Amino acid sequence: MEAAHSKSTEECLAYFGVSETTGLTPDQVKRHLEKYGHNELPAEEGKSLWELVIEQFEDLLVRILLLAACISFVLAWFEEGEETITAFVEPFVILLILIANAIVGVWQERNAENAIEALKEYEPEMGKVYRADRKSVQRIKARDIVPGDIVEVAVGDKVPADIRILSIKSTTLRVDQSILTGESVSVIKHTEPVPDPRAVNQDKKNMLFSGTNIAAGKALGIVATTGVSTEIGKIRDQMAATEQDKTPLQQKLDEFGEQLSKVISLICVAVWLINIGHFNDPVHGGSWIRGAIYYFKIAVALAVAAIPEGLPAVITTCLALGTRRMAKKNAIVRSLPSVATLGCTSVICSDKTGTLTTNQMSVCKMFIIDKVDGDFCSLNEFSITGSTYAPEGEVLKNDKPIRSGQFDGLVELATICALCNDSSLDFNETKGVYEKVGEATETALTTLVEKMNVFNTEVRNLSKVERANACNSVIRQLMKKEFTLEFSRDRKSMSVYCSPAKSSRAAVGNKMFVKGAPEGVIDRCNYVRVGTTRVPMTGPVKEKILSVIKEWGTGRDTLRCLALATRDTPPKREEMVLDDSSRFMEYETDLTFVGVVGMLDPPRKEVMGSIQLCRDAGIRVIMITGDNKGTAIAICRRIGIFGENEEVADRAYTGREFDDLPLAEQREACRRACCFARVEPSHKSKIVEYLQSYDEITAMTGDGVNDAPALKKAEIGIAMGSGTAVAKTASEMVLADDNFSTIVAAVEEGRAIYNNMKQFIRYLISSNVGEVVCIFLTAALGLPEALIPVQLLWVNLVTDGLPATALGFNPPDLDIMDRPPRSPKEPLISGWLFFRYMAIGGYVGAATVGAAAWWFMYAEDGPGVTYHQLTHFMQCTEDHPHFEGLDCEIFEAPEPMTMALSVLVTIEMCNALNSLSENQSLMRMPPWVNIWLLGSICLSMSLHFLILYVDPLPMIFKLKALDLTQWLMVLKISLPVIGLDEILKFIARNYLEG
Ligand SMILES: Nc1ncnc2c1ncn2[C@@H]1O[C@H](COP(=O)(O)OP(=O)(O)CP(=O)(O)O)[C@@H](O)[C@H]1O
Ligand SMILES: [Ca+2]
Ligand SMILES: [Ca+2]
Ligand SMILES: [Ca+2]
Ligand SMILES: [K+]
């Protein structure tokens, strides 16, 4: 460990005793592993704690019941409500339903965490180091990195350990340090010592902290600290979780839960304002104080009833349940609420290279110049065999094997490929295959040089490791590479400044080797390499070249082309400024065209099928890439974005064509175009911006850093598992499988969550409206009170509890993917659904009021009150003045109240079965499709029986029930609500709107 940034780069190398150009030795790693251990963290991976995870109570709807539980305990502390023990029970039926949902919520989330960590553990984090094993570079498991060895980082990488920067190989080096210092914008680094030992992490501008990403550039450094000695390691538990998330679904639910909290506020204020006239009845006893307080209780007890306290839990359950299902499809949900958003997505933007395609590349076609005779131009087209990164294959011309060394243009094409290249070939001795190091594109050139072998290097008797970079090491032995002009997405090309390695002649040898996008390089080509000679770039030549390039990119091979050129007379080293890269394009002028290579890059096997499925789900797909349009168009046709013969005149644009359009037609283009090529990281970020300006939910799929702005901007970023860390950090979901078909299943799961969330709402609204209607109806018609504040708080515990939450386990509808996606501007509750809520709640209230009233009449055991509703309270005690009041006092009886109660419990259990699907009949979506619901109902019902028959309990809640004759009655009344809602489903089942 070196806790020093105040020390210079030489002082840091001296600290561990390492050479910058060799690295650590096997013995040195053995010893440093004993001393410093592995590079990893032991425990508590975003695990929270046992009791502090259940402290998620801090939701508004839940908070209300908490305060309600206190004032229900405060009034109880006075022993009020004309009762002793049941007063202390009131706050506990409230706590129980909260404890219930809080447990299920926590229970589900812990499973999501345990599914995620099992998947991240299936693919180890990696890092690149230089050790004395090889002259070359080797990347290892991030855990096998020790304080001392020389580590290499680059664009899109995640910094594996706390590293003192040694050499910044690029013009600039920017780092995303948001995870540690909060610095949003990318941060520049350097290599000079920071003498202050006490300097804060923000000022350590010569350090690379672990867990952070490289925004731009390439750098070499030395590891100071690993494992827990890492800066981010010291703050593992402290600041465990910090994120930003406010999804559209969450926003709608917050707006819903807010205004819904306002109606219940008024109703319960109304409830208290209405029955302020029964303030003095001989039951409560004329005590005005104990009159308004009782109805303050029923108002609060009704609030608790009406309020969906399970809403924060059912949201939590569905999301965590969704995160787990996606984890089974090898997807990593980096944000629970984001699963819901991918359900109501209308358009999906996608990167091409490495996202829609496999990014497994290989040069299979290439041409140079044959002859230029006036208006006549001819090329030497070549075919190369071998599609893997292996150096076994042959160069062909008209299907005949050819020594590449004979053609001089091929010697130069092989030279530009070898030098103007930052990648290499490693032969994995444990996998037994040739793997790439760096970009797949540049690597495709590396293997080409090997297959060409223009200098005929003996390779028949080499090892499989030596064979990897033989023909390339020959060219590097020949040419000393002075420095590299970076690849810039503005000029879309790069170059190396090279002189003869042996330095045989200073005057004779000096070249700049350029490769990049054809149209750019060729436009800057003033000469054309014919053989070993040189001729001026003319119209016909440029036409003939670009014609064959078009022949390849549009062809059924779908080729990826790079033009190769050499600036014959480059500027002097001191005539060039390497600080900025904006000057680099002019350095790549006066070029001499050498040749063009064409790459193979097959679309992923399941892309075409996935795209076609989205088209059936009302979802549009837009390809966005920095590659050629002609090539990009022919891919869209092959994967189902365009037809084989679609007219794409105004549905495919380039970066220049797009920008040439007014901001009006720039925005309009995004509504019809499905292919944008030759674009920028900003373009990708703006195409999403334009799509979002149409009130559409947008998803972005990428793998590179050029996607990061677009990935962050979209409602859902989706990065490939084989993609970059920057892309993954920018996205909310990661396809670790690289399976594009998962995006399809993530949409189906996303819509299924929205539906179950609706069924939760429809249930708790339609049912609880009945709870409101019940109290409002008995009062309006001058009937005895149906419910007691404790009875209101019991039905709430049992009907708003688990049967509510179990709705989050509903199987999705059968036609869930055949319907168009839901508009973002849709009301959470439609105009028609609000009618269903009332129709059910209307009957429910009526059904449960007629319950208590029936006891007063047609019940044989109950005393009769004749016909035409003779219910008035004048009798009371000593009915001296009355109308046919043979009975002394029928009021304040426990029996009629339990009748109204048991109906509610049964009738609200009933439409929970109706809440299995929005429109599907119970004949196609039976009760046993959601077993968790049946369990809740069984429990909830059996929990009702226990209260009625275990005798220390019916004293607490005023009730006494007949064993059979009453249960038969409440069933006759409850079951029709299943019938009623069934009618309403059939109504929308035959009339399809929505
Ligand atoms: N390493 C390299 N050296 C020189 N030129 C390169 C290069 N890599 C890419 N290019 C050229 O730059 C152009 C744009 O690169 P860019 O990264 O912006 O788009 P891209 O197609 O390579 C990634 P994607 O297709 O996933 O959007 C490419 O079309 C290619 O012709
Ligand atoms: Ca409730
Ligand atoms: Ca890419
Ligand atoms: Ca209810
Ligand atoms: K995003």
Short mmCIF file of C-alpha atoms and ligand atoms in Angstrom, two decimals, residues 711-717 730 732, ligand 5:
data_model
loop_
_atom_site.label_atom_id
_atom_site.label_comp_id
_atom_site.label_asym_id
_atom_site.label_seq_id
_atom_site.Cartn_x
_atom_site.Cartn_y
_atom_site.Cartn_z
CA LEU A 711 -28.48 6.25 -22.74
CA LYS A 712 -28.80 8.73 -19.87
CA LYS A 713 -31.30 10.91 -21.74
CA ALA A 714 -33.81 8.16 -22.55
CA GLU A 715 -36.44 7.00 -20.05
CA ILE A 716 -34.69 3.62 -20.19
CA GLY A 717 -31.06 3.05 -21.09
CA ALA A 730 -25.39 5.42 -18.05
CA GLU A 732 -30.83 1.48 -16.01
K K B 5 -31.81 6.97 -18.62
#
